[PDB]
Amino acid sequence: AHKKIFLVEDNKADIRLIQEALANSTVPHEVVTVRDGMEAMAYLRQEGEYANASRPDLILLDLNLPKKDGREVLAEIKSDPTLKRIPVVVLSTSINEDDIFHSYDLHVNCYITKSANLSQLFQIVKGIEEFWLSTATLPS
Amino acid sequence: AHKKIFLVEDNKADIRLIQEALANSTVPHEVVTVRDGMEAMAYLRQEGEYANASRPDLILLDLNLPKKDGREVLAEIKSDPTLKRIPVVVLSTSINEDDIFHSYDLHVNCYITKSANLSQLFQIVKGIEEFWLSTATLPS
Numbered sequence: 001a002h003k004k005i006f007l008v009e010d011n012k013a014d015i016r017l018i019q020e021a022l023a024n025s026t027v028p029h030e031v032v033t034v035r036d037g038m039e040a041m042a043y044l045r046q047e048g049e050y051a052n053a054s055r056p057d058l059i060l061l062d063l064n065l066p067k068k069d070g071r072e073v074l075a076e077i078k079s080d081p082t083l084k085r086i087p088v089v090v091l092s093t094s095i096n097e098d099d100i101f102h103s104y105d106l107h108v109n110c111y112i113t114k115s116a117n118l119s120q121l122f123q124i125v126k127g128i129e130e131f132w133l134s135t136a137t138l139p140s
Numbered sequence: 141a142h143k144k145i146f147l148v149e150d151n152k153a154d155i156r157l158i159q160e161a162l163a164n165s166t167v168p169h170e171v172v173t174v175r176d177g178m179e180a181m182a183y184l185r186q187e188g189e190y191a192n193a194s195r196p197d198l199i200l201l202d203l204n205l206p207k208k209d210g211r212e213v214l215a216e217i218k219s220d221p222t223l224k225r226i227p228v229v230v231l232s233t234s235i236n237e238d239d240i241f242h243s244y245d246l247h248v249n250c251y252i253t254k255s256a257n258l259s260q261l262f263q264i265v266k267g268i269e270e271f272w273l274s275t276a277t278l279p280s
């Protein structure tokens with residue numbers, strides 16, 4: 001009984017920290033990380049090599065992504081008849097007001113800005129894990 | 141169950157001595173050394189070629205390092221949510237009250253003034269080894 005978390009992020013530093021914070025969970029989880037919007041969609045639509053990759057229970061989405069940005073990934077996921085139910089938490093350095101408004105308008109479940117202080121960000125990821133992987137009841 | 145010690149030192153003479161002082165161990169220790177602060181942080185943050193280097197269980201840090209001093213190394217280590225728990229033993233020749241104050245202020249675990257005579261320095265390293273790698277209960 002393990003939940004899968006799909007992290008779409010390219011910053012290796014953040015990837016490391018995020019993976020470390022999620023690793024210190026009270027319940028083991030599976031974290032799959034892809035580094036660009038393209039891979040993100042291919043993985044979620046189980047296209048190609050990602051033929052048998054199981055559906056994630058939670059998606060953590062960075063916005064400024066290579067190839068295809070998070071804004072586009074979000075719009076395509078929340079518009080898809082089947083992927084739209086997967087909770088998406090945008091976790092980004094962006095404090096841009098347009099990004100905030102647009103993300104919620106596209107039905108993102110939640111928007112979180114990456115802290116400037118590593119330890120703070122670490123605690124934020126812990127909050128994400130505790131609330132979504134423990135307190136909330138996820139679909140399916 | 142072997143212990144991994146990370147030595148940040150540029151004085152080849154001290155490196156040789158410390159290495160030897162840590163060779164005696166029923167369960168062989170894994171000693172890794174780097175000669176400068178830049179290399180130290182890259183290694184600890186698992187950047188690039190160090191992407192797969194395991195986290196040490198103890199760090200021994202020199203202050204007057206090339207291209208990036210131990211002061212900065214200490215601050216960056218103690219501010220990182222994934223490295224801040226690794227015990228850091230500052231082992232330097234400095235007896236400067238300024239270095240002592242700042243090092244403890246930055247959360248160094250302990251500060252040790254190297255002993256001139258290579259032999260006494262040996263007994264000091266043995267003290268470090270017994271207390272930290274045997275007496276204390278490490279987070280690792």
Ligand SMILES: [Mg+2]
Nearest residue numbers: 010062064065
């Ligand atoms: Mg990015």
Ligand SMILES: [Mg+2]
Nearest residue numbers: 150202204205
């Ligand atoms: Mg030096």
